[PDB]
């Protein structure tokens, strides 16, 4: 799956935390089953995204990585 995970968040790759938890707040809750019932496998890319992003560490590799 090569959508890379700031674009998964529909965020700038300088995305500070603070804008990585509003970007995460806002695609979980367009996926509020009442918009996309359907949205469980986007909601887990979503997740995955976070989850790297969120974490220094992680996301420094993430970043070397490119």
Same mark, same amino acid.
């Given at each position: &799956?090569?959508? #890379?995970?700031?674009? $998964? =968040? #529909? $965020? @700038?790759?300088? !995305?500070?935390? +603070?804008e =990585? &938890?509003? !970007?995460?707040?806002?695609?979980? =809750? @367009?996926?509020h089953?009442? &918009? +996309?019932?359907?949205? !469980?496998?986007?909601? &887990?890319?979503?997740?995955? !995204?976070?989850? $790297? =992003?969120?974490?220094?560490? @992680?996301?420094?590799?993430?970043?070397? #990585? #490119?």
């Amino acid at each position: &799956k090569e959508t #890379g995970y700031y674009d $998964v =968040l #529909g $965020v @700038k790759p300088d !995305a500070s935390d +603070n804008e =990585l &938890k509003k !970007a995460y707040r806002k695609m979980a =809750l @367009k996926f509020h089953p009442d &918009k +996309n019932p359907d949205g !469980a496998e986007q909601f &887990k890319q979503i997740s995955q !995204a976070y989850e $790297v =992003l969120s974490d220094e560490k @992680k996301r420094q590799i993430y970043d070397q #990585g #490119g």
